[PDB]
Amino acid sequence: PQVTLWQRPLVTIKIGGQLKEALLDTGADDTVLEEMSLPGRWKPKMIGGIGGFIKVRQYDQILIEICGHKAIGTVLVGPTPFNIIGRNLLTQIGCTLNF
Amino acid sequence: PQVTLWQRPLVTIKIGGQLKEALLDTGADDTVLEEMSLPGRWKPKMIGGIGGFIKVRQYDQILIEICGHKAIGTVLVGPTPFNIIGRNLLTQIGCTLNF
Numbered sequence: 001p002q003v004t005l006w007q008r009p010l011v012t013i014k015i016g017g018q019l020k021e022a023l024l025d026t027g028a029d030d031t032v033l034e035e036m037s038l039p040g041r042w043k044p045k046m047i048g049g050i051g052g053f054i055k056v057r058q059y060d061q062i063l064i065e066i067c068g069h070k071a072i073g074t075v076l077v078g079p080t081p082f083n084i085i086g087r088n089l090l091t092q093i094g095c096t097l098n099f
Numbered sequence: 100p101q102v103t104l105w106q107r108p109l110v111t112i113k114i115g116g117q118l119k120e121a122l123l124d125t126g127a128d129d130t131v132l133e134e135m136s137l138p139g140r141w142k143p144k145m146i147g148g149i150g151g152f153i154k155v156r157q158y159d160q161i162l163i164e165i166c167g168h169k170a171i172g173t174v175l176v177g178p179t180p181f182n183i184i185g186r187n188l189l190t191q192i193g194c195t196l197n198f
């Protein structure tokens with residue numbers, strides 16, 4: 001759908017049998033999700049943002065349905081204020097930025 | 100123009116007589132530029148990012164060319180690692196997110 005930027009672009013995602021709300025985020029290379037339970041294995045990782053670096057658990061390849069659209073990729077779970085869908089999944093649902 | 104997100108969506112801005120590149124960031128409510136020489140005076144603000152919070156100078160009423168497009172807005176200048184243009188200016192250059 002087309003989404004204007006007068007408001008945060010949040011979408012509903014279902015991950016892991018749970019529904020979440022997440023921000024669509026063109027500056028983020030990676031999807032980062034607030035602490036939640038996934039089944040399976042993960043790797044420790046660190047990413048930086050404004051403010052600092054956080055240590056995060058890298059899970060792949062997780063199925064996520066974002067709006068209607070299914071995608072599979074790496075998600076990282078950690079101490080983020082908000083669930084962020086970054087460009088690794090945005091490419092997968094065909095998202096463009098248009099001005 | 101239409102950007103796909105296989106790379107980071109970078110644009111040239113002209114800000115304060117200086118040419119820079121910045122990231123078009125739908126997740127960022129506020130535009131934050133690395134420290135630079137801006138005239139005029141300002142107010143301290145803090146904003147929060149993913150690794151915590153950063154303290155920045157707030158200038159209002161700043162002219163930016165972002166691609167061909169002039170906008171006038173609030174710019175925070177401070178300890179970011181990238182120049183981010185956020186939704187306060189994105190909305191002025193008429194940016195849409197599309198999937």
Ligand SMILES: O=C(Nc1nccs1)c1cccc(CN2C(=O)N(Cc3cccc(C(=O)Nc4nccs4)c3)[C@H](Cc3ccccc3)[C@H](O)[C@@H](O)[C@H]2Cc2ccccc2)c1
Nearest residue numbers: 027028029030047048049050126127128129146147148149
């Ligand atoms: O993959 C990532 N990093 C990797 N590291 C290594 C490999 S990959 C990664 C994934 C998600 C987010 C980010 C880090 N990140 C942020 O920290 N901010 C804070 C931000 C940026 C700009 C403005 C504001 C703002 O307006 N804050 C405000 N607070 C109060 C009022 S306004 C906030 C938000 C997201 C956000 C919003 C609210 C709370 C928390 C975060 C941006 O929207 C993101 O795109 C991105 C920007 C960025 C990108 C690269 C390096 C540094 C910074 C990085």
